[PDB]
mmCIF file of C-alpha atoms and ligand atoms in Angstrom:
data_model
loop_
_atom_site.group_PDB
_atom_site.id
_atom_site.type_symbol
_atom_site.label_atom_id
_atom_site.label_comp_id
_atom_site.label_asym_id
_atom_site.label_seq_id
_atom_site.Cartn_x
_atom_site.Cartn_y
_atom_site.Cartn_z
ATOM 1 C CA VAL A 1 -6.375 -11.144 111.289
ATOM 2 C CA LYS A 2 -9.557 -10.831 113.217
ATOM 3 C CA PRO A 3 -11.574 -12.935 115.634
ATOM 4 C CA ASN A 4 -14.684 -14.724 114.397
ATOM 5 C CA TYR A 5 -16.950 -14.813 117.445
ATOM 6 C CA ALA A 6 -20.195 -16.643 116.674
ATOM 7 C CA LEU A 7 -23.299 -17.023 118.822
ATOM 8 C CA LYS A 8 -23.441 -20.413 120.550
ATOM 9 C CA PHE A 9 -25.975 -20.134 123.401
ATOM 10 C CA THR A 10 -28.650 -17.794 124.732
ATOM 11 C CA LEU A 11 -29.167 -17.861 128.507
ATOM 12 C CA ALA A 12 -32.718 -16.860 129.481
ATOM 13 C CA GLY A 13 -34.349 -16.770 132.892
ATOM 14 C CA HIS A 14 -33.892 -13.373 134.497
ATOM 15 C CA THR A 15 -37.141 -11.408 134.639
ATOM 16 C CA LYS A 16 -35.577 -7.924 134.459
ATOM 17 C CA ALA A 17 -32.461 -6.267 133.052
ATOM 18 C CA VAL A 18 -29.224 -8.186 133.503
ATOM 19 C CA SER A 19 -26.617 -5.970 135.152
ATOM 20 C CA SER A 20 -23.358 -7.956 135.122
ATOM 21 C CA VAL A 21 -21.812 -11.240 133.992
ATOM 22 C CA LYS A 22 -18.502 -12.726 135.187
ATOM 23 C CA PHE A 23 -16.623 -15.956 134.433
ATOM 24 C CA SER A 24 -15.260 -17.903 137.384
ATOM 25 C CA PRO A 25 -11.437 -18.006 137.603
ATOM 26 C CA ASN A 26 -11.446 -21.798 137.161
ATOM 27 C CA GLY A 27 -13.301 -21.408 133.844
ATOM 28 C CA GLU A 28 -16.238 -23.642 134.761
ATOM 29 C CA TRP A 29 -18.989 -21.125 135.516
ATOM 30 C CA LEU A 30 -20.670 -17.863 134.584
ATOM 31 C CA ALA A 31 -22.425 -15.722 137.195
ATOM 32 C CA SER A 32 -25.061 -13.116 136.338
ATOM 33 C CA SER A 33 -26.743 -10.424 138.425
ATOM 34 C CA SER A 34 -29.988 -8.661 137.611
ATOM 35 C CA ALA A 35 -32.451 -5.944 138.539
ATOM 36 C CA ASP A 36 -34.772 -8.844 139.463
ATOM 37 C CA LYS A 37 -32.742 -9.159 142.737
ATOM 38 C CA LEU A 38 -31.339 -12.562 141.688
ATOM 39 C CA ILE A 39 -27.968 -14.119 140.927
ATOM 40 C CA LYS A 40 -27.881 -17.021 138.484
ATOM 41 C CA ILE A 41 -25.070 -19.503 137.828
ATOM 42 C CA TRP A 42 -24.567 -21.071 134.393
ATOM 43 C CA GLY A 43 -22.126 -23.485 132.803
ATOM 44 C CA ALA A 44 -19.407 -21.510 131.031
ATOM 45 C CA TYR A 45 -19.011 -23.932 128.113
ATOM 46 C CA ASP A 46 -22.606 -25.043 127.460
ATOM 47 C CA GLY A 47 -24.682 -22.239 129.016
ATOM 48 C CA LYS A 48 -26.617 -24.764 131.104
ATOM 49 C CA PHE A 49 -28.514 -23.213 134.006
ATOM 50 C CA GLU A 50 -27.113 -24.376 137.344
ATOM 51 C CA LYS A 51 -28.774 -22.437 140.176
ATOM 52 C CA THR A 52 -30.497 -19.263 141.330
ATOM 53 C CA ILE A 53 -29.131 -17.421 144.378
ATOM 54 C CA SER A 54 -31.518 -15.123 146.239
ATOM 55 C CA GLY A 55 -31.552 -12.852 149.272
ATOM 56 C CA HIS A 56 -31.132 -9.211 148.271
ATOM 57 C CA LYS A 57 -34.251 -7.090 148.779
ATOM 58 C CA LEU A 58 -33.616 -4.725 145.836
ATOM 59 C CA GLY A 59 -31.922 -5.066 142.457
ATOM 60 C CA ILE A 60 -28.257 -5.987 142.032
ATOM 61 C CA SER A 61 -25.738 -3.991 139.976
ATOM 62 C CA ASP A 62 -22.625 -6.181 140.135
ATOM 63 C CA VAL A 63 -21.290 -9.604 141.115
ATOM 64 C CA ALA A 64 -17.721 -10.880 141.441
ATOM 65 C CA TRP A 65 -15.891 -14.176 142.049
ATOM 66 C CA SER A 66 -13.308 -15.089 144.639
ATOM 67 C CA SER A 67 -10.019 -16.409 143.279
ATOM 68 C CA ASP A 68 -10.788 -20.024 144.257
ATOM 69 C CA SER A 69 -14.176 -19.839 142.435
ATOM 70 C CA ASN A 70 -15.976 -20.790 145.667
ATOM 71 C CA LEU A 71 -17.436 -17.409 146.703
ATOM 72 C CA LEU A 72 -19.352 -14.549 145.119
ATOM 73 C CA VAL A 73 -19.883 -10.984 146.284
ATOM 74 C CA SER A 74 -22.849 -8.938 145.060
ATOM 75 C CA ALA A 75 -23.591 -5.203 145.209
ATOM 76 C CA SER A 76 -27.205 -4.112 145.608
ATOM 77 C CA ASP A 77 -29.525 -1.109 145.660
ATOM 78 C CA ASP A 78 -30.495 -2.262 149.169
ATOM 79 C CA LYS A 79 -27.230 -0.577 150.341
ATOM 80 C CA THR A 80 -25.508 -3.882 151.189
ATOM 81 C CA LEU A 81 -23.089 -6.306 149.684
ATOM 82 C CA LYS A 82 -23.525 -10.016 150.288
ATOM 83 C CA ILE A 83 -20.896 -12.761 150.321
ATOM 84 C CA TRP A 84 -22.212 -16.071 148.985
ATOM 85 C CA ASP A 85 -21.097 -19.679 149.097
ATOM 86 C CA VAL A 86 -21.691 -20.701 145.482
ATOM 87 C CA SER A 87 -22.025 -24.453 146.060
ATOM 88 C CA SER A 88 -24.727 -24.069 148.733
ATOM 89 C CA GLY A 89 -26.265 -20.732 147.715
ATOM 90 C CA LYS A 90 -26.044 -19.566 151.330
ATOM 91 C CA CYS A 91 -25.384 -15.948 152.246
ATOM 92 C CA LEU A 92 -22.289 -16.034 154.460
ATOM 93 C CA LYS A 93 -22.120 -12.326 155.363
ATOM 94 C CA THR A 94 -24.072 -9.142 154.715
ATOM 95 C CA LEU A 95 -21.759 -6.126 154.453
ATOM 96 C CA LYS A 96 -23.465 -3.036 155.905
ATOM 97 C CA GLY A 97 -22.019 0.468 155.941
ATOM 98 C CA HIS A 98 -22.788 2.263 152.689
ATOM 99 C CA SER A 99 -25.551 4.857 152.978
ATOM 100 C CA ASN A 100 -26.951 4.451 149.438
ATOM 101 C CA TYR A 101 -26.907 2.024 146.500
ATOM 102 C CA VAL A 102 -23.793 -0.110 146.063
ATOM 103 C CA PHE A 103 -22.784 -0.094 142.395
ATOM 104 C CA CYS A 104 -19.548 -2.089 142.022
ATOM 105 C CA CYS A 105 -17.487 -4.747 143.812
ATOM 106 C CA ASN A 106 -14.435 -6.999 143.482
ATOM 107 C CA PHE A 107 -12.314 -9.413 145.505
ATOM 108 C CA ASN A 108 -8.571 -8.905 145.762
ATOM 109 C CA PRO A 109 -6.344 -11.670 144.324
ATOM 110 C CA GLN A 110 -5.845 -13.394 147.683
ATOM 111 C CA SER A 111 -9.616 -12.894 148.218
ATOM 112 C CA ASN A 112 -9.284 -11.943 151.829
ATOM 113 C CA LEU A 113 -10.572 -8.451 150.975
ATOM 114 C CA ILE A 114 -13.524 -6.969 149.101
ATOM 115 C CA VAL A 115 -13.638 -3.473 147.589
ATOM 116 C CA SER A 116 -16.928 -1.677 146.908
ATOM 117 C CA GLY A 117 -18.117 1.589 145.414
ATOM 118 C CA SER A 118 -21.395 3.313 146.082
ATOM 119 C CA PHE A 119 -23.794 6.081 145.138
ATOM 120 C CA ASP A 120 -22.778 7.533 148.531
ATOM 121 C CA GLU A 121 -19.475 8.562 146.817
ATOM 122 C CA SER A 122 -17.221 6.373 149.006
ATOM 123 C CA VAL A 123 -15.051 3.321 148.409
ATOM 124 C CA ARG A 124 -15.051 0.736 151.197
ATOM 125 C CA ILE A 125 -12.615 -2.101 151.910
ATOM 126 C CA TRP A 126 -14.071 -5.120 153.708
ATOM 127 C CA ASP A 127 -12.673 -8.147 155.532
ATOM 128 C CA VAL A 128 -14.119 -11.284 153.934
ATOM 129 C CA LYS A 129 -13.736 -13.480 157.019
ATOM 130 C CA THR A 130 -15.417 -11.159 159.540
ATOM 131 C CA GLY A 131 -17.651 -9.222 157.147
ATOM 132 C CA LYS A 132 -16.588 -5.932 158.748
ATOM 133 C CA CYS A 133 -15.528 -2.712 157.052
ATOM 134 C CA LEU A 134 -11.800 -2.048 157.434
ATOM 135 C CA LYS A 135 -11.529 1.317 155.647
ATOM 136 C CA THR A 136 -13.876 3.966 154.258
ATOM 137 C CA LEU A 137 -12.168 6.044 151.569
ATOM 138 C CA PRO A 138 -13.594 9.536 150.779
ATOM 139 C CA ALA A 139 -12.919 8.651 147.194
ATOM 140 C CA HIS A 140 -15.095 10.868 145.001
ATOM 141 C CA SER A 141 -17.694 13.650 144.872
ATOM 142 C CA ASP A 142 -20.191 11.722 142.713
ATOM 143 C CA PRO A 143 -21.319 8.074 142.591
ATOM 144 C CA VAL A 144 -18.508 5.540 142.182
ATOM 145 C CA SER A 145 -18.844 3.636 138.907
ATOM 146 C CA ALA A 146 -16.095 0.994 139.192
ATOM 147 C CA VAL A 147 -13.538 -0.480 141.611
ATOM 148 C CA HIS A 148 -10.784 -2.976 140.760
ATOM 149 C CA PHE A 149 -7.670 -4.491 142.354
ATOM 150 C CA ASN A 150 -4.446 -4.844 140.400
ATOM 151 C CA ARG A 151 -2.904 -8.258 139.814
ATOM 152 C CA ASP A 152 -1.097 -8.504 143.077
ATOM 153 C CA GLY A 153 -3.661 -6.611 145.166
ATOM 154 C CA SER A 154 -1.392 -3.773 146.308
ATOM 155 C CA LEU A 155 -3.489 -1.171 144.456
ATOM 156 C CA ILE A 156 -7.127 -0.251 143.883
ATOM 157 C CA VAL A 157 -8.397 1.849 140.982
ATOM 158 C CA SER A 158 -11.723 3.666 141.283
ATOM 159 C CA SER A 159 -13.730 5.756 138.845
ATOM 160 C CA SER A 160 -16.535 8.192 139.125
ATOM 161 C CA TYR A 161 -18.965 10.518 137.449
ATOM 162 C CA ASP A 162 -17.104 13.352 139.033
ATOM 163 C CA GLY A 163 -14.691 12.627 136.138
ATOM 164 C CA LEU A 164 -11.733 11.218 138.098
ATOM 165 C CA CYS A 165 -9.837 7.964 138.152
ATOM 166 C CA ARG A 166 -7.912 7.459 141.385
ATOM 167 C CA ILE A 167 -5.241 4.936 142.379
ATOM 168 C CA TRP A 168 -5.235 3.848 146.027
ATOM 169 C CA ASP A 169 -2.731 2.002 148.201
ATOM 170 C CA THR A 170 -4.647 -0.993 149.554
ATOM 171 C CA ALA A 171 -2.673 -1.244 152.800
ATOM 172 C CA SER A 172 -2.791 2.432 153.804
ATOM 173 C CA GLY A 173 -5.824 3.793 151.946
ATOM 174 C CA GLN A 174 -3.877 6.668 150.577
ATOM 175 C CA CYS A 175 -4.511 8.181 147.210
ATOM 176 C CA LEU A 176 -1.378 7.695 145.113
ATOM 177 C CA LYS A 177 -2.575 9.258 141.844
ATOM 178 C CA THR A 178 -5.516 11.183 140.378
ATOM 179 C CA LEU A 179 -6.073 11.153 136.606
ATOM 180 C CA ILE A 180 -7.630 14.416 135.402
ATOM 181 C CA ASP A 181 -9.203 15.396 132.070
ATOM 182 C CA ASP A 182 -9.681 19.094 131.314
ATOM 183 C CA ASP A 183 -12.992 18.371 129.568
ATOM 184 C CA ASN A 184 -13.903 16.168 132.558
ATOM 185 C CA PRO A 185 -16.351 13.658 131.038
ATOM 186 C CA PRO A 186 -17.940 11.321 133.593
ATOM 187 C CA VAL A 187 -15.886 8.144 133.990
ATOM 188 C CA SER A 188 -18.248 5.178 133.807
ATOM 189 C CA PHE A 189 -15.833 2.232 134.126
ATOM 190 C CA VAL A 190 -12.194 1.436 134.880
ATOM 191 C CA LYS A 191 -10.010 -1.634 135.414
ATOM 192 C CA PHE A 192 -6.321 -2.530 135.453
ATOM 193 C CA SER A 193 -4.637 -4.112 132.449
ATOM 194 C CA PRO A 194 -3.447 -7.748 132.615
ATOM 195 C CA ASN A 195 0.182 -6.709 133.170
ATOM 196 C CA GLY A 196 -0.877 -4.243 135.895
ATOM 197 C CA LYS A 197 0.830 -1.251 134.258
ATOM 198 C CA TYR A 198 -2.156 0.367 132.520
ATOM 199 C CA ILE A 199 -5.790 1.170 133.207
ATOM 200 C CA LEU A 200 -8.671 1.000 130.738
ATOM 201 C CA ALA A 201 -11.191 3.789 131.356
ATOM 202 C CA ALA A 202 -14.614 4.387 129.806
ATOM 203 C CA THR A 203 -16.028 7.911 129.641
ATOM 204 C CA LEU A 204 -19.602 8.913 128.784
ATOM 205 C CA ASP A 205 -18.463 10.626 125.576
ATOM 206 C CA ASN A 206 -18.427 7.333 123.626
ATOM 207 C CA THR A 207 -14.726 6.767 124.341
ATOM 208 C CA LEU A 208 -12.451 4.140 125.866
ATOM 209 C CA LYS A 209 -8.843 5.002 126.711
ATOM 210 C CA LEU A 210 -5.770 3.008 127.740
ATOM 211 C CA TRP A 211 -3.772 5.009 130.302
ATOM 212 C CA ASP A 212 -0.322 4.666 131.800
ATOM 213 C CA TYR A 213 -1.462 5.721 135.260
ATOM 214 C CA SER A 214 2.092 6.213 136.570
ATOM 215 C CA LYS A 215 2.913 8.740 133.870
ATOM 216 C CA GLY A 216 -0.588 10.105 133.372
ATOM 217 C CA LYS A 217 -0.311 9.515 129.618
ATOM 218 C CA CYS A 218 -2.944 8.156 127.245
ATOM 219 C CA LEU A 219 -1.491 5.451 124.997
ATOM 220 C CA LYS A 220 -4.552 4.288 123.030
ATOM 221 C CA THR A 221 -8.097 5.467 122.322
ATOM 222 C CA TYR A 222 -10.990 3.276 121.142
ATOM 223 C CA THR A 223 -14.152 4.715 119.573
ATOM 224 C CA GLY A 224 -17.036 3.769 117.285
ATOM 225 C CA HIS A 225 -19.466 2.454 119.913
ATOM 226 C CA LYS A 226 -22.217 4.297 121.812
ATOM 227 C CA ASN A 227 -21.787 5.089 125.521
ATOM 228 C CA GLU A 228 -23.331 8.293 126.896
ATOM 229 C CA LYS A 229 -25.512 6.977 129.737
ATOM 230 C CA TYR A 230 -24.674 3.616 131.309
ATOM 231 C CA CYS A 231 -21.731 2.132 133.210
ATOM 232 C CA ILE A 232 -20.743 -0.452 130.589
ATOM 233 C CA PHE A 233 -18.069 -3.020 131.407
ATOM 234 C CA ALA A 234 -14.994 -3.327 129.178
ATOM 235 C CA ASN A 235 -12.415 -6.121 129.018
ATOM 236 C CA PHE A 236 -8.984 -7.211 127.838
ATOM 237 C CA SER A 237 -9.136 -10.523 125.946
ATOM 238 C CA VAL A 238 -6.032 -12.563 126.801
ATOM 239 C CA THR A 239 -6.740 -16.013 125.345
ATOM 240 C CA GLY A 240 -6.114 -15.388 121.637
ATOM 241 C CA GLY A 241 -5.509 -12.125 119.828
ATOM 242 C CA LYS A 242 -5.054 -8.990 121.909
ATOM 243 C CA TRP A 243 -8.548 -7.468 121.802
ATOM 244 C CA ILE A 244 -10.535 -4.897 123.753
ATOM 245 C CA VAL A 245 -14.173 -5.935 124.288
ATOM 246 C CA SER A 246 -17.085 -3.730 125.364
ATOM 247 C CA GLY A 247 -20.846 -3.462 125.306
ATOM 248 C CA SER A 248 -22.632 -0.562 123.680
ATOM 249 C CA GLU A 249 -25.868 1.414 123.735
ATOM 250 C CA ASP A 250 -26.560 0.443 120.104
ATOM 251 C CA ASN A 251 -27.089 -3.167 121.364
ATOM 252 C CA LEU A 252 -23.832 -4.535 119.884
ATOM 253 C CA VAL A 253 -20.686 -6.028 121.348
ATOM 254 C CA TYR A 254 -17.642 -4.152 120.042
ATOM 255 C CA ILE A 255 -14.198 -5.728 119.657
ATOM 256 C CA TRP A 256 -11.099 -3.612 118.944
ATOM 257 C CA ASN A 257 -7.496 -4.421 118.118
ATOM 258 C CA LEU A 258 -5.523 -3.383 121.220
ATOM 259 C CA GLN A 259 -2.549 -2.047 119.261
ATOM 260 C CA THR A 260 -4.065 -0.565 116.070
ATOM 261 C CA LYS A 261 -7.337 0.592 117.737
ATOM 262 C CA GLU A 262 -9.391 -0.601 114.737
ATOM 263 C CA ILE A 263 -12.764 -2.251 115.225
ATOM 264 C CA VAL A 264 -12.323 -5.906 114.276
ATOM 265 C CA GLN A 265 -15.798 -7.322 115.027
ATOM 266 C CA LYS A 266 -19.309 -6.231 116.012
ATOM 267 C CA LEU A 267 -21.530 -8.916 117.557
ATOM 268 C CA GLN A 268 -25.211 -8.638 116.615
ATOM 269 C CA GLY A 269 -27.839 -10.482 118.642
ATOM 270 C CA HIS A 270 -29.120 -8.520 121.631
ATOM 271 C CA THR A 271 -32.284 -6.395 121.521
ATOM 272 C CA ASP A 272 -31.367 -3.808 124.187
ATOM 273 C CA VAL A 273 -28.269 -2.054 125.539
ATOM 274 C CA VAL A 274 -25.386 -4.472 126.115
ATOM 275 C CA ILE A 275 -24.428 -3.360 129.626
ATOM 276 C CA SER A 276 -21.913 -6.099 130.452
ATOM 277 C CA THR A 277 -19.330 -8.282 128.734
ATOM 278 C CA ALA A 278 -16.830 -10.793 130.113
ATOM 279 C CA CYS A 279 -13.971 -12.816 128.628
ATOM 280 C CA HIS A 280 -13.296 -16.448 129.531
ATOM 281 C CA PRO A 281 -9.945 -17.006 131.308
ATOM 282 C CA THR A 282 -8.635 -19.804 129.040
ATOM 283 C CA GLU A 283 -10.900 -20.169 125.967
ATOM 284 C CA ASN A 284 -11.930 -17.616 123.328
ATOM 285 C CA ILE A 285 -15.419 -17.175 124.796
ATOM 286 C CA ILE A 286 -17.304 -13.918 125.400
ATOM 287 C CA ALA A 287 -20.392 -13.511 127.575
ATOM 288 C CA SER A 288 -22.685 -10.523 126.988
ATOM 289 C CA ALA A 289 -25.760 -9.273 128.845
ATOM 290 C CA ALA A 290 -28.490 -6.777 127.980
ATOM 291 C CA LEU A 291 -31.085 -4.520 129.604
ATOM 292 C CA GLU A 292 -34.832 -4.687 130.173
ATOM 293 C CA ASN A 293 -36.135 -5.240 126.629
ATOM 294 C CA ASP A 294 -33.789 -8.242 126.256
ATOM 295 C CA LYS A 295 -33.040 -9.801 129.692
ATOM 296 C CA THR A 296 -30.752 -12.502 128.249
ATOM 297 C CA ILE A 297 -27.093 -13.473 128.366
ATOM 298 C CA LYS A 298 -25.343 -14.665 125.213
ATOM 299 C CA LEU A 299 -22.244 -16.847 124.839
ATOM 300 C CA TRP A 300 -20.016 -16.319 121.780
ATOM 301 C CA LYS A 301 -17.019 -18.410 120.702
ATOM 302 C CA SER A 302 -14.129 -17.676 118.337
ATOM 303 C CA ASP A 303 -11.147 -19.453 116.796
ATOM 304 C CA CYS A 304 -8.744 -16.697 117.884
HETATM 305 N N1 LIG B 401 -0.890 -1.570 122.226
HETATM 306 C C1 LIG B 401 -0.169 -1.708 123.123
HETATM 307 C C2 LIG B 401 0.755 -1.870 124.245
HETATM 308 C C3 LIG B 401 0.710 -3.385 124.770
HETATM 309 C C4 LIG B 401 1.030 -4.448 123.896
HETATM 310 C C5 LIG B 401 1.017 -5.785 124.303
HETATM 311 C C6 LIG B 401 0.684 -6.098 125.608
HETATM 312 O O1 LIG B 401 0.687 -7.420 125.957
HETATM 313 C C7 LIG B 401 0.346 -5.091 126.519
HETATM 314 N N2 LIG B 401 0.018 -5.421 127.889
HETATM 315 S S1 LIG B 401 -1.594 -5.366 128.452
HETATM 316 O O2 LIG B 401 -2.178 -4.123 127.951
HETATM 317 O O3 LIG B 401 -1.609 -5.694 129.859
HETATM 318 C C8 LIG B 401 -2.415 -6.691 127.632
HETATM 319 C C9 LIG B 401 -3.579 -6.433 126.899
HETATM 320 C C10 LIG B 401 -4.220 -7.496 126.260
HETATM 321 BR BR1 LIG B 401 -5.794 -7.186 125.251
HETATM 322 C C11 LIG B 401 -3.719 -8.792 126.353
HETATM 323 C C12 LIG B 401 -2.559 -9.040 127.096
HETATM 324 C C13 LIG B 401 -1.910 -7.989 127.739
HETATM 325 O O4 LIG B 401 -0.779 -8.302 128.444
HETATM 326 C C14 LIG B 401 0.376 -3.749 126.100
HETATM 327 C C15 LIG B 401 0.683 -0.713 125.305
HETATM 328 C C16 LIG B 401 1.700 0.064 124.449
HETATM 329 C C17 LIG B 401 2.183 -1.298 123.924
#
């Protein structure tokens, strides 16, 4: 048993490296961000271009959807985040406060809050309605590589190149747990598991790990790919078989069996580092995006 992801569409149009791709929660759309300072919206099932969203004055590292699929937030080298109305393309709010590049962002499940992480080593929590910063967390001592809310929104997980993963209480801003590795490889990505009990963490020693953050115990390790430089997204695939999905610096998409940790598929098609992957919420569809020598997004579909 293995998935059989096959290339269905190639999505071209960005003029520089693509930095992130995300499927909307309602399954209809894909959003992409790029070093060309643009956001593009595409049909999730047919890859059809829908619109370009513009406004940032430097490149964009990350984009994220609100839970009702109506808003996007983007994180830019221009030190701001921007909240967007997707249907109109209008910038609703510009979130100012970080003192250097903003690298990562996410809405909470109710989507009344935004979390961000920056080169300035802080994590900020923002009010969507007013656009104002509610909390500044002194989260790390190196740039923040990822931020993510758990399934109910009571917790935030952050990661950094200082080598730490930290769990934060959303309401109070307190640090509830710090995950430490004696070899201390830079942590380049983290996110909560679908059931909220685990975190998946990428380190720049070509390794992904599944952690029980409450116990500080590593349950699973996934290797075989290449990741020593970039902050590459990783995913849990919940629509068919239980797979882990990640990009790689050898230009492939890697898919692992969650439980056995074996590689089950490698997706060949991109011509530069696959920096970002995303999994469709209801169908067995993967989106992948690559860096400057490629500049495209690819949609892959599987029977399981
Ligand atoms: N091995 C393994 C374990 C496992 C097995 C089965 C699971 O469902 C989960 N929960 S999870 O990690 O949140 C999850 C991952 C994927 Br991919 C899909 C759905 C989903 O609930 C976790 C951890 C030790 C047993």
